[PDB]
Amino acid sequence: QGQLKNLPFYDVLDVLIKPTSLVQSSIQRFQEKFFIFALTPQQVREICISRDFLPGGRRDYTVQVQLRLCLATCPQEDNYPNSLCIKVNGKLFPLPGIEQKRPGRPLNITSLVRLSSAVPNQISISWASEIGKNYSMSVYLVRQLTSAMLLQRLKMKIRNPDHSRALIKEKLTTSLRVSLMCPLGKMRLTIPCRAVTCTHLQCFDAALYLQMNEKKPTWICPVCDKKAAYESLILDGLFMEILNDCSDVDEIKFQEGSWCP
Numbered sequence: 731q732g733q734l735k736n737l738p739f740y741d742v743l744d745v746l747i748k749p750t751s752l753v754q755s756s757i758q759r760f761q762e763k764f765f766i767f768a769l770t771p772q773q774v775r776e777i778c779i780s781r782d783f784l785p786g787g788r789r790d791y792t793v794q795v796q797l798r799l800c801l802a803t804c805p806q807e808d809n810y811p812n813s814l815c816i817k818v819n820g821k822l823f824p825l826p827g828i829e830q831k832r833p834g835r836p837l838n839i840t841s842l843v844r845l846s847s848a849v850p851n852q853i854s855i856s857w858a859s860e861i862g863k864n865y866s867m868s869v870y871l872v873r874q875l876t877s878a879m880l881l882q883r884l885k886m887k888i889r890n891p892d893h894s895r896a897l898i899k900e901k902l903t904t905s906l907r908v909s910l911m912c913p914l915g916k917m918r919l920t921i922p923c924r925a926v927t928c929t930h931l932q933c934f935d936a937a938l939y940l941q942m943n944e945k946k947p948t949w950i951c952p953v954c955d956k957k958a959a960y961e962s963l964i965l966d967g968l969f970m971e972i973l974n975d976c977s978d979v980d981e982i983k984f985q986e987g988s989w990c991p
């Protein structure tokens with residue numbers, strides 16, 4: 731209870747505060763709760779040496795303290811309570827009526843964190859309750875990953891050319907036409923990719939798809955607009971073979987796994 735969905739661009743290094751119910755008075759609308767964590771000496775050093783270019787162009791800590799809120803039992807997306815107000819060591823953390831419907835995201839609170847092991851850090855959370863909607867907070871130490879990093883990991887996880895040949899033949903059992911260009915970026919595919927759930931043969935470029943979700947993480951497949959989560963992604967060996975053999979060719983027709991332009 732209170733566990734959140736995995737974020738593909740973060741590695742969890744530690745749980746600083748385990749999922750914890752934000753208990754509400756039933757009588758008063760507005761609520762406030764305080765939480766303490768304390769970094770170890772090695773965690774402080776971890777943050778301090780971690781600075782690098784982030785997306786946006788800013789140099790900052792890539793090892794971060796990340797606060798997440800969600801409804802309360804299975805893994806949930808980030809969701810905020812009505813009138814959420816967060817203070818960290820007394821300083822207000824700006825966030826990036828009855829029906830507040832604004833979508834939650836993880837909060838990088840590192841820049842208000844006291845980078846010390848001798849002194850505890852403190853977080854205050856205020857909110858206004860809503861009937862039959864219960865929330866939970868947790869705080870993690872995370873390393874933010876780039877798209878290159880996700881790409882690399884994705885490479886270490888690729889699909890037999892024969893799998894797609896059987897979909898070709900178990901589909902045609904006229905002519906099956908497919909493009910070698912990215913529907914996202916319009917240039918020639920470099921690393922061809924789709925979700926295992928996708929029933930189409932058309933691929934998209936892994937690197938460019940992960941660059942887009944790095945900025946605005948929607949995880950929607952550009953070909954068919956179904957869910958295309960990071961963990962569902964595969965790289966098609968067949969389209970990789972075809973890419974190393976073609977040049978100046980944009981589209982191909984498959985027959986009963988042969989292929990012409």
Ligand SMILES: [Zn+2]
Pocket residue numbers: 924925928929930951952953954955956958
């Ligand atoms: Zn799709």
